[PDB]
């Protein structure tokens, strides 16, 4: 399928995010995926609004790449494992069921929520849903942690029974501290919960 990977970060001075951007862009070039990257400074800078911004950036990606079938959001703290950069996304996940609108990933047993949306596949037919997710950013309880992640799991999922899958995260949302043993074989490696300087240091070793 036509896949558009999207992400974003501000400011440009944040080195780890420059590096993850580079690796994602390279990965897209290898497999012919579209790549959308939001470099603008957010107008709403509170923690909740920052987390929700992915559901606004997806519309940017849809406008730029109208032929997209699958949108793939990656946090700026996610990168493509160099060992696996020559392998397409479809070698790791089956996107053939026409009924699915979201592919998401758990973070068990080490995490704190049933899904981790640092990596999130959204079908083109869920763009109007993402518009709703964005609209909920300033309404309780969706404006409370974990924000868009809670909104997807607790607002969206109940309303689309059978049209989402929660997958093991070992290859596609491979949280570094939680699944160190799987990092080597992952496609998407997720530097979740760590500081900027810690991320800079990790990326230097990549």
Binding residues for UDP-alpha-D-glucose: 8, 10, 54, 75-76, 199
Instruction: Kindly state the smallest distance separating residue 115's Cβ from Mn ion, in Å.
Output: 13
Measured distance CA(57)–CA(4) in Å, rounded: 12
Interaction of residue 192 with Mn ion, rule CB under 5 A? yes
- Rounded Cα distance between 194 and 192, Å, is 6
Q: How far apart are alpha carbons 175 and 112 in whole angstroms? A: 12
Under 8 Å between Cβ of 189 and 166? no
Closest-by-Cβ residue to Mn ion is 75
**Interface map 27-66 toward Mn ion (x if CB under 5 A):** ----------------------------------------
From 6-14, 46-54, 96-104, 114-122, span contacting Mn ion (CB under 5 A): 114-122
What are the structure tokens assigned to 66, written together? 């109208």
Q: Among 21, 102, 118, 129, indicate the residue that binds Mn ion (CB under 5 A).
A: 118
Return the beta strands (E) in the chain as ranges: 3-8, 34-38, 70-74, 78-80, 102-105, 119-123, 164-167, 174-175, 188-190
Choice between 101 and 192, CB closer to Mn ion? 192
Q: Supply the minimum distance, in Å, between the C-beta of residue 118 and Mn ion.
A: 4
Contacts (CB under 5 A) with Mn ion, residues 67-86:
75, 77
Calpha distance 18→20 (Å, rounded): 6
* Residues within the interface to Mn ion (CB under 5 A): 75, 77, 118, 192
């Amino acid at each position: 399928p036509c896949i558009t990977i999207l992400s974003g970060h501000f400011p440009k001075e944040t080195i780890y995010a420059r590096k993850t951007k580079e690796l994602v862009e390279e990965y897209c070039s290898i497999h012919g995926y579209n790549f959308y990257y939001e470099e603008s400074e957010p107008l709403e800078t509170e923690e909740h609004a920052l987390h929700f911004r992915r559901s606004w950036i997806i519309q940017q990606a849809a406008e730029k790449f109208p032929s997209t079938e699958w949108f793939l959001w990656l946090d700026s703290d996610v990168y493509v494992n160099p060992k696996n950069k020559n392998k397409p996304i479809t070698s790791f996940i089956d996107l053939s069921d026409p009924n699915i609108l979201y592919h998401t990933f758990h973070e068990a047993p080490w995490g704190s929520y049933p899904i981790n949306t640092g990596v999130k596949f959204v079908h083109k037919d869920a763009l109007e849903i993402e518009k709703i997710v964005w609209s909920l950013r300033n309404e309780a309880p969706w404006n409370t942690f974990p924000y868009e992640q809670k909104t997807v799991y607790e607002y969206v999922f109940p309303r689309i029974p059978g049209r989402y899958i929660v997958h093991d995260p070992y290859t596609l949302n491979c949280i570094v501290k939680a699944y160190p043993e799987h990092v080597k074989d992952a496609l998407f490696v997720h530097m979740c919960g760590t500081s900027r300087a810690e991320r800079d240091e990790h990326m230097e070793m990549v």
